[PDB]
Amino acid sequence: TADELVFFVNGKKVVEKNADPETTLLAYLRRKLGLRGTKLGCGEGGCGACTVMLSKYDRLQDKIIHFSANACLAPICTLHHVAVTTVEGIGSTKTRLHPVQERIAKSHGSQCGFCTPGIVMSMYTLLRNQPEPTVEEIEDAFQGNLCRCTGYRPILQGFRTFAK
Amino acid sequence: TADELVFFVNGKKVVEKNADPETTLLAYLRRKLGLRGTKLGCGEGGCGACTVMLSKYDRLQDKIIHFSANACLAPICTLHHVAVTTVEGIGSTKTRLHPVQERIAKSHGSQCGFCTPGIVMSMYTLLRNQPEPTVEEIEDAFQGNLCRCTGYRPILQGFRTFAK
Amino acid sequence: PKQLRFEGERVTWIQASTLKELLDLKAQHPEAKLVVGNTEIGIEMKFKNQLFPMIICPAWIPELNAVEHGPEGISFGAACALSSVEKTLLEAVAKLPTQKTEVFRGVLEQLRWFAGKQVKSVASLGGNIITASPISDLNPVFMASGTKLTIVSRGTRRTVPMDHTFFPSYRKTLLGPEEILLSIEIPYSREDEFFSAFKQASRREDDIAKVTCGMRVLFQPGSMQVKELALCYGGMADRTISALKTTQKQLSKFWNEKLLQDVCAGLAEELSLSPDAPGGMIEFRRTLTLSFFFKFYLTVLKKLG
Amino acid sequence: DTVGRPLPHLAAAMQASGEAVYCDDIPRYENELFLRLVTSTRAHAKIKSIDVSEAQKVPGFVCFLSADDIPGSNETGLFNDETVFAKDTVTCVGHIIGAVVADTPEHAERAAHVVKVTYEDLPAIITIEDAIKNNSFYGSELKIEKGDLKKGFSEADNVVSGELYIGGQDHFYLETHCTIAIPKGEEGEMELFVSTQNAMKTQSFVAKMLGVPVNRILVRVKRMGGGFGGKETRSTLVSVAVALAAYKTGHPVRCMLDRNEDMLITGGRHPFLARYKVGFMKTGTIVALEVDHYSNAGNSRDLSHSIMERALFHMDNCYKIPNIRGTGRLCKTNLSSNTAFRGFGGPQALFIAENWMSEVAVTCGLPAEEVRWKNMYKEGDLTHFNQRLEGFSVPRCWDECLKSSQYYARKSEVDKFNKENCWKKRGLCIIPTKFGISFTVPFLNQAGALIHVYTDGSVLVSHGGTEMGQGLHTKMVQVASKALKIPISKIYISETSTNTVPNSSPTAASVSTDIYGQAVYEACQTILKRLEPFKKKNPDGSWEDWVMAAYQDRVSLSTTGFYRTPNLGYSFETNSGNAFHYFTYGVACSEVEIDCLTGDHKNLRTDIVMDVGSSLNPAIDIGQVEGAFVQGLGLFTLEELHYSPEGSLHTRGPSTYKIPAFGSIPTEFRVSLLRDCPNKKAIYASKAVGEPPLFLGASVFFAIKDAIRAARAQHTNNNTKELFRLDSPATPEKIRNACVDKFTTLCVTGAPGNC
Amino acid sequence: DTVGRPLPHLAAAMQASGEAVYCDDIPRYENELFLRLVTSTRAHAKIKSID
Amino acid sequence: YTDGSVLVSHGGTEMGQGLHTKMVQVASKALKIPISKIYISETSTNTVPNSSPTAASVSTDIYGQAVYEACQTILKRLEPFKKKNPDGSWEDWVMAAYQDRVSLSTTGFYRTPNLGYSFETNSGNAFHYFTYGVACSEVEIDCLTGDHKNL
Ligand SMILES: Cc1cc2nc3c(=O)[nH]c(=O)nc-3n(C[C@H](O)[C@H](O)[C@H](O)COP(=O)(O)OP(=O)(O)OC[C@H]3O[C@@H](n4cnc5c(N)ncnc54)[C@H](O)[C@@H]3O)c2cc1C
Numbered sequence A, B: 001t002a003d004e005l006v007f008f009v010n011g012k013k014v015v016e017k018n019a020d021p022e023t024t025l026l027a028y029l030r031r032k033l034g035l036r037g038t039k040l041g042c043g044e045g046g047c048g049a050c051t052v053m054l055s056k057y058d059r060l061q062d063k064i065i066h067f068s069a070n071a072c073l074a075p076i077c078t079l080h081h082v083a084v085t086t087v088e089g090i091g092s093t094k095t096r097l098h099p100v101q102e103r104i105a106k107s108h109g110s111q112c113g114f115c116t117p118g119i120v121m122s123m124y125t126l127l128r129n130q131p132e133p134t135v136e137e138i139e140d141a142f143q144g145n146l147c148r149c150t151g152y153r154p155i156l157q158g159f160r161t162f163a164k
Numbered sequence C: 001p002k003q004l005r006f007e008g009e010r011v012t013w014i015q016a017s018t019l020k021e022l023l024d025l026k027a028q029h030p031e032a033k034l035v036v037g038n039t040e041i042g043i044e045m046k047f048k049n050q051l052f053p054m055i056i057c058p059a060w061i062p063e064l065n066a067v068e069h070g071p072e073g074i075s076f077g078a079a080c081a082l083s084s085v086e087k088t089l090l091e092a093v094a095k096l097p098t099q100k101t102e103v104f105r106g107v108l109e110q111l112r113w114f115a116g117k118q119v120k121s122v123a124s125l126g127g128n129i130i131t132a133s134p135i136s137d138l139n140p141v142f143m144a145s146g147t148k149l150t151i152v153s154r155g156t157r158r159t160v161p162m163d164h165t166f167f168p169s170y171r172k173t174l175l176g177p178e179e180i181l182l183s184i185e186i187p188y189s190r191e192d193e194f195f196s197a198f199k200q201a202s203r204r205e206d207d208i209a210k211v212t213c214g215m216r217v218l219f220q221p222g223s224m225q226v227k228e229l230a231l232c233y234g235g236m237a238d239r240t241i242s243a244l245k246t247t248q249k250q251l252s253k254f255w256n257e258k259l260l261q262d263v264c265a266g267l268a269e270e271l272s273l274s275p276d277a278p279g280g281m282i283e284f285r286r287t288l289t290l291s292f293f294f295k296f297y298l299t300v301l302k303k304l305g
Numbered sequence D: 001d002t003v004g005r006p007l008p009h010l011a012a013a014m015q016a017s018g019e020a021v022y023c024d025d026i027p028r029y030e031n032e033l034f035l036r037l038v039t040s041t042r043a044h045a046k047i048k049s050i051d052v053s054e055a056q057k058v059p060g061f062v063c064f065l066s067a068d069d070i071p072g073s074n075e076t077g078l079f080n081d082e083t084v085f086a087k088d089t090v091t092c093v094g095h096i097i098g099a100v101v102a103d104t105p106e107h108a109e110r111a112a113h114v115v116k117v118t119y120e121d122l123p124a125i126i127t128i129e130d131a132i133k134n135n136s137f138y139g140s141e142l143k144i145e146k147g148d149l150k151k152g153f154s155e156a157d158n159v160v161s162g163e164l165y166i167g168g169q170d171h172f173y174l175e176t177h178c179t180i181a182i183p184k185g186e187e188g189e190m191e192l193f194v195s196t197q198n199a200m201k202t203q204s205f206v207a208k209m210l211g212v213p214v215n216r217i218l219v220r221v222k223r224m225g226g227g228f229g230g231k232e233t234r235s236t237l238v239s240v241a242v243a244l245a246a247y248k249t250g251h252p253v254r255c256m257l258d259r260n261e262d263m264l265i266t267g268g269r270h271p272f273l274a275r276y277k278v279g280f281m282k283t284g285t286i287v288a289l290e291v292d293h294y295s296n297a298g299n300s301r302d303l304s305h306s307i308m309e310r311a312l313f314h315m316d317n318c319y320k321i322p323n324i325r326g327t328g329r330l331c332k333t334n335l336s337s338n339t340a341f342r343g344f345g346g347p348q349a350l351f352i353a354e355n356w357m358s359e360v361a362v363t364c365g366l367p368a369e370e371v372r373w374k375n376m377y378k379e380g381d382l383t384h385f386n387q388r389l390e391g392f393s394v395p396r397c398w399d400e401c402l403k404s405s406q407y408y409a410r411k412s413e414v415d416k417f418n419k420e421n422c423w424k425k426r427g428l429c430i431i432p433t434k435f436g437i438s439f440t441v442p443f444l445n446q447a448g449a450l451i452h453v454y455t456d457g458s459v460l461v462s463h464g465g466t467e468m469g470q471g472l473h474t475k476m477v478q479v480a481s482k483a484l485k486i487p488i489s490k491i492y493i494s495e496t497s498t499n500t501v502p503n504s505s506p507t508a509a510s511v512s513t514d515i516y517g518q519a520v521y522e523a524c525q526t527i528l529k530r531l532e533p534f535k536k537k538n539p540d541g542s543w544e545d546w547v548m549a550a551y552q553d554r555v556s557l558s559t560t561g562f563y564r565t566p567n568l569g570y571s572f573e574t575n576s577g578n579a580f581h582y583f584t585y586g587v588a589c590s591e592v593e594i595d596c597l598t599g600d601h602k603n604l605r606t607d608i609v610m611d612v613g614s615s616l617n618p619a620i621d622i623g624q625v626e627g628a629f630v631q632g633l634g635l636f637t638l639e640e641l642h643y644s645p646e647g648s649l650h651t652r653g654p655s656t657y658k659i660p661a662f663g664s665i666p667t668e669f670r671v672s673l674l675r676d677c678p679n680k681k682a683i684y685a686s687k688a689v690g691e692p693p694l695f696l697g698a699s700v701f702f703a704i705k706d707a708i709r710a711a712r713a714q715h716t717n718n719n720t721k722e723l724f725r726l727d728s729p730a731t732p733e734k735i736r737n738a739c740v741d742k743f744t745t746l747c748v749t750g751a752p753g754n755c
Numbered sequence E: 001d002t003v004g005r006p007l008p009h010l011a012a013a014m015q016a017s018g019e020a021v022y023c024d025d026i027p028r029y030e031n032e033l034f035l036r037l038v039t040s041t042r043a044h045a046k047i048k049s050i051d
Numbered sequence F: 001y002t003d004g005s006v007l008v009s010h011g012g013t014e015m016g017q018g019l020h021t022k023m024v025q026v027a028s029k030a031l032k033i034p035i036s037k038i039y040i041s042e043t044s045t046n047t048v049p050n051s052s053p054t055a056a057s058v059s060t061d062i063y064g065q066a067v068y069e070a071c072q073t074i075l076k077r078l079e080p081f082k083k084k085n086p087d088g089s090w091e092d093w094v095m096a097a098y099q100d101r102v103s104l105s106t107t108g109f110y111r112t113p114n115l116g117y118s119f120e121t122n123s124g125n126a127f128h129y130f131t132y133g134v135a136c137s138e139v140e141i142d143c144l145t146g147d148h149k150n151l
């Protein structure tokens, strides 16, 4: 007889009464919750298209912590009492874009657009931990994100505006 | 603690484990089974757009009986061990049309087509009871079917070919 | 927290709240599979069609997440994320004298261009170790440094330094069916002790034929005379290995051109690859084992001077 | 008028917010099913049995589809030499044998893995060498010849001959192949949503497999998360399978490939082997060239022939060669069929050209830039295929790149560095390129549009081209706005669809802006012609006023537009007629530092000058230059596909196949568009930009080769005119092995050695 | 040339078979919702409140 | 399309009156090809914009003319290929046209001439023409009930 799985997505409570241990967060977001901003690019942790932010109250540090994770590899069964933030949780064209989203778009950092949600979430996570990053911290933030279209220069240029 | 409802649609077994007494056969056919040949035209028994054939074994008469019914008013809960036949159960353009279907089409008995399934099922039911009906039996078969387009003449003329 | 049970089509998952629970469940079901970050298990299930009908997640257990500073080194619970290890070691390097942080600096070098922030935030330290990939960038450093592993089951507890014997065969470690890795102590460097780590800049096969290494030398006090030498390599076999035959021969020798010659001759022989060895790149890999040692040799000379 | 302004890509904000819809983002129907391909694990074998008994046990399993289920035809592919589903024999690892259909993609995946296939191996051919030895080719030799090779070689002071190999490339679009197919249940009707550059062939191939007329099939393409040529034809592998599932079940069905499936099944860039011989003077002037090209085509023809034609058209790069013979052969092998990839045979031929040119310079003991400049075409020269070079801007790009990159000063610094460092070396190279613009098949150089102006004055544009991130819809909106003299805010493009513009060519060859821009322009002209009387009657009224007046006077506000590129048609049997409309040109200079002990390297600085005529949108064009260059840098230096001896791909995802990362790009990365160079031959004086810059990535390769030469001077021997073979990609393995020293030779161990 | 001939309505066979698709016959998306109008019960009136 | 199959779209909608049937008959006559090569799938605002409602009984008249005009445009474009291959098939001619980069897509349009009645001058044509008919009916009434039979 199974326990309920309880987590949050974009501030909203999810009660999953019949969690399957095999279910990934990416599958859950896209196919149960209908939040399709987060993408599948490889399923093996190398491309970052599925990048989300995770938050929890770490009982051992007595502190709220925020970090990035590949939704394609995160079992939902690891997420009890964790808060998930996806690209649609930080801004939209129907409300207002987040500065991260505005800057990558206006700086010509998005061509086909398929990698853009993952990169946005990598930058957002950095700013959530460090609102005054250095140029150096900004490049290291993207080792887990691949883009086939842009050659990366415009993405870094637009984001460097957040530095120091 | 509810019992299972078991019936048949076009020769296929339906096992409803959670039947709602308020569910009509028309709603079940269209919105659970996805058999959309049977139409809603009034929901009050007057138009026959939702006509299907029901078959059951009669104990008192010691035979299988066949009769027509308005799916819009048939509770699925009355149908335990009854066999339902819809328009898709008698023929199709992907396999072979039933004679009733071919004749109404070729005789100009179908304009917008919305009443055609119900009329087909009324004529089909008659022929299942009486393979050689009289002209008089043919018109009576349709007191419960309305058509707004044809003025009825071509439908009766086409089906007259089954008579004598 | 309390223990949770989730039930799927094929898999039962137990979220263990305490160490006692974990050891009880592992005694009750020795075949139960541990999962922390799932960065290896997820790949096994999806791509190698492995199925583990019982999974235990120990991520919530305090003991598996503890970071402890001791007289001999820094102890990390086995569920600590690599990002946390990296942060702790960077702080240690920043505050402690260079001579004490030679092993830490080696770990940090191996973590430098190692997966994104996403992977490092959930990949556990113990997970990398027990995964036991021939091309783990971490196990060569842990082997060369004699990093101590505390291993526990219901009614057992033992602390062993990692050495060549810890990886008996492909993807296997010297753990019992019931045992779990509790904590990992990365040692302080001593006086007259130096360390380097290097890795190949390319990978062409899933888990073989990427050269990666840890190298340690301990000299007799104030000397250039070798007292201990350890050179451990991934990507040269089906497990992490130590060039023991080569290093044993250098004991009491002095750190000079003759030692460079002899070690290079030893490595070429001891780590020799057949023309048809899995992963290919035969010449390149041999050249790297020697080139990495050369870099270590020069670096140790600069540290000595 | 926004033409020439750096307007952001129209969907950029929605892409950043995760609101832009890609194929798999489309909501699922209540009854929609999922397909997973079942694929060969053998390079070449007879199929003896397919066992689905274990797959039927998987919860949610619907059916297994194979060849016997097809109602129409199992014959498919551009040249009708493929199967939809393999029947008796498999001819590559990854060869599609059938498909599982299930209620979830997880269930489909589970079921597909437990389908058991039994095989009987047949002799396989995997490498180009295998193919040559076995005479295993598609069709006959392709050739272009000009001048007198004997005579040319007689007059030469020096002759250099060699062999060279360039590995292939996986597209690695971030969005893999995907199709949704919706059967209507009437008259064979089906509506498909597909990530494809080729809605027309998708439509035809589906219709052919089903055995229904083409008019029954509607194909819709909103956008792709990248194509790069890999969705020009190979997308039909998934589309046709999913269409069959839809037909068979009567349910909607979809499939999106996992990365590992996509890399195995869908084909990549063609590997090339070249055998070459060049004759040259002591000055470095070229007098004779012979090159035999061989491509690894895989297990069907697909676009292999046209790819080799383009290779042969670019074997000159930017150099005048009076006596020349190039040939090409397509190798038939038991590997997934290779296909279009950005550059389309061009980068391979250009790489081969720059390789022997590099050896000419070394042999003559002259500076490479001097030798390249000396041999460059001039304005008005004929290529080896006898096309005149009109508007030849390479000399301008060259001069400006030399100046802005400070080439000569940086060359001295490179020499200084190499003087002072033993185990690290720097290299620096400057490389030109020209790229012919047009499909080499004349009939594909046609384009349609359809424009409607609604009674509120808003305009809906439809054209044959597809958006894959290159900003085509953006540019078409900019063109329509300029043509009609209304704001971009009044114009919209929703998608590409076979029921708005029929018979479209694939979105390819870098010409979409040129041809759809013309089609859109012409349609706009027709609209203006119709509105002119209303404008005349009300010259101070608004667009809206004119549109409403026209509507009330029963003037049609809907029109087609069409364009066909004029004066095209090259003959191999005369060596005359225009192969291309014009050429796009550019120059790149790159500097690298190599670690001689490890084979790792740093990209220090790259400067690019590109002739794109008068850019419709400099932000988009600079983006295309940068993106293309980085893909070329990947081809030449990072990306390596690796196969078992049995012909099975080992490198099936980002852990084992390394595309350029954030940290891979040149530390200083500069791109300039050449000024004051209008192109009379295309829309609003612009030039095609998509593919031409990719080969410039080879500047990194030749910088690396320069650095290796320095390492060899340091530790290998004393022969400054030595030619060593360096194949592509120049991976750490190749770089390290080339720096021959006391380690590679084992001289450090006390052994005698070749250093 | 069929102009002037009594060709049956092109969709008649599919209409007789229930294969012809009308608006509500279109399958529903997984997330598709249903609307019902709320309507006046008075010929002419001020709306005071809606609960 | 390049198989010779034809897709017709027009501003009119099908409500049971057989408009698409008639449009297919017209297209088949105009193009001189069998009705089996022609299809009408639906009516849509992204294929034919600014359409009048399907009303006033004139849909056959006006969409028939529009379809006829588009068909004539197609025939004109195909004519040279017919002349090069006079023993050939429809399908052969269409493929020849495609490969010679001749467009196989066209619009058609019709505007009814000479309409414009004025209520302030009582002149100008209100209608294009008039349709006529006569009916004779016989009934029997039941004077006691008000029922009747249409005989
Ligand atoms: C994209 C990516 C890039 C990577 N790059 C590198 C790289 O460059 N170099 C490198 O070395 N590695 C690399 N890795 C591997 C990575 O470090 C490991 O996968 C990770 O550390 C495993 O930890 P986990 O918590 O996710 O393990 P899990 O997948 O949860 O478990 C892994 C294994 O360890 C066992 N296990 C876990 N905890 C314990 C315990 N405490 N006691 C006993 N057994 C236990 C499990 O049963 C299982 O067999 C990469 C991984 C990814 C996905």
Ligand SMILES: Nc1nc2c(c(=O)[nH]1)N[C@H]1C(S)=C(S)[C@@H](COP(=O)(O)O)O[C@H]1N2
Pocket (backbone or CB within 6 Å): A111, A112, A149, D226, D227, D228, D229, D341, D342, D343, D468, D469, D470, D472, D507, D508, D509, D510, D511, D512, D513, D624, D627, D689, D690, D691
């Ligand atoms: N962002 C992006 N840019 C891209 C591609 C792509 O898929 N994505 N494909 C390339 C290829 S292979 C070609 S042929 C051109 C095609 O588009 P165009 O003709 O509109 O330039 O875009 C190029 N640039």
Ligand SMILES: O=Cc1c[nH]c2ccccc12
Pocket (backbone or CB within 6 Å): D303, D306, D310, D340, D344, D438, D439, D440, D441, D444, D508, D509
């Ligand atoms: O010449 C470029 C090209 C791209 N795709 C195709 C297809 C057929 C012929 C030529 C081409």
Ligand code: MOS
Pocket (backbone or CB within 6 Å): D197, D228, D229, D230, D232, D340, D341, D342, D343, D344, D507, D508, D509, D510, D691
């Ligand atoms: O011609 Mo681009 O599709 S390779």
Ligand code: MOS
Pocket (backbone or CB within 6 Å): F054, F055, F056, F057
């Ligand atoms: O003119 Mo008919 O739509 S009343």
Ligand code: FES
Pocket (backbone or CB within 6 Å): A039, A040, A041, A042, A043, A044, A045, A046, A047, A048, A049, A050, A051, A070, A071, A072, A073
């Ligand atoms: S989908 Fe590529 S890292 Fe998750």
Ligand code: FES
Pocket (backbone or CB within 6 Å): A109, A110, A111, A112, A113, A114, A115, A116, A146, A147, A148, A149, A150, D174, D225, D226, D469
């Ligand atoms: S914009 Fe296309 S993958 Fe990054």
Ligand code: FES
Pocket (backbone or CB within 6 Å): B039, B040, B041, B042, B043, B044, B045, B046, B047, B048, B049, B050, B051, B070, B071, B072, B073
């Ligand atoms: S819908 Fe009218 S009688 Fe049932």
Ligand code: FES
Pocket (backbone or CB within 6 Å): B109, B110, B111, B112, B113, B114, B115, B116, B146, B147, B148, B149, B150, F016
């Ligand atoms: S045909 Fe229209 S209601 Fe009968």
